[PDB]
């Protein structure tokens, strides 16, 4: 549906603009993002990964459309606990790394209709939310690695991207 930017790319390092209003054009990006995300078997996507520099996230932790989450202009209000899993990312294909995260987050955001909601999450949902928000600030999971590890990932994908 949309093309996923592959690390390294400058638009994966940008702090994105909030959505000014959630209208039809924004709902179309959201639906196009979900299509892209399911097609590549992701459980989260952020707009900058499809080269749209706005604060828009689509998440589906189960992958079956029965607990979708759209988070527009999201903000973590509070959090607690400590956790970490081996995260991957559609813009960083072929790699996973252990990222330290909050176990629990409270997040406010606008839904696909522009309505504000405030959500408590834990488990994999909370991890996905923190991951995807990182994207909106131009942060990738490789930024939590040592400079040399991140570099070696970058070199490998530079090559991959040519070979595609
Ligand atoms: Ni990601």
UniProtKB/Swiss-Prot annotation:
It catalyses: N-terminal N-formyl-L-methionyl-[peptide] + H2O = N-terminal L-methionyl-[peptide] + formate. Its cofactor is Fe(2+). Fe cation binds at residues 89, 131, 135. Gene3D superfamilies: Peptide deformylase. GO terms for biological process: co-translational protein modification; translation. The active site is at 132. Its EC number is 3.5.1.88. SUPFAM superfamilies: Peptide deformylase. GO terms for molecular function: metal ion binding; peptide deformylase activity. The keyword Mitochondrion does not apply. Removes the formyl group from the N-terminal Met of newly synthesized proteins. Requires at least a dipeptide for an efficient rate of reaction. N-terminal L-methionine is a prerequisite for activity but the enzyme has broad specificity at other positions. Belongs to the polypeptide deformylase family. This is Peptide deformylase. It comes from Haemophilus influenzae (strain 86-028NP). The lineage of its organism: Bacteria, Pseudomonadati, Pseudomonadota, Gammaproteobacteria, Pasteurellales. The gene is def.
């Amino acid at each position: 549906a949309l093309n996923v930017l592959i690390y390294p790319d400058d638009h994966l390092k940008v702090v994105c603009e909030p959505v000014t209003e959630v209208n039809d054009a924004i709902r179309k990006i959201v639906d196009d993002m979900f299509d892209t995300m399911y097609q590549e078997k992701g459980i989260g996507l952020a707009a900058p990964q499809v080269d749209i520099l706005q604060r828009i996230i689509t998440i589906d932790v189960e992958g079956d459309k029965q607990n979708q989450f759209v988070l527009i202009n999201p903000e973590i209000l509070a959090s607690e606990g400590e956790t970490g899993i081996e995260e991957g990312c559609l813009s960083i294909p072929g790699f996973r790394a252990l990222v330290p995260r909050k176990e629990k987050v409270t997040v406010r955001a606008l839904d696909r209709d522009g309505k504000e909601f405030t959500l408590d999450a834990d488990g994999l949902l909370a991890i996905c939310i923190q991951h995807e928000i990182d994207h909106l600030n131009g942060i990738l999971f490789v930024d939590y690695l040592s400079p040399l590890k991140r570099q070696r990932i970058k070199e490998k994908l530079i090559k991959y991207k040519k070979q595609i």
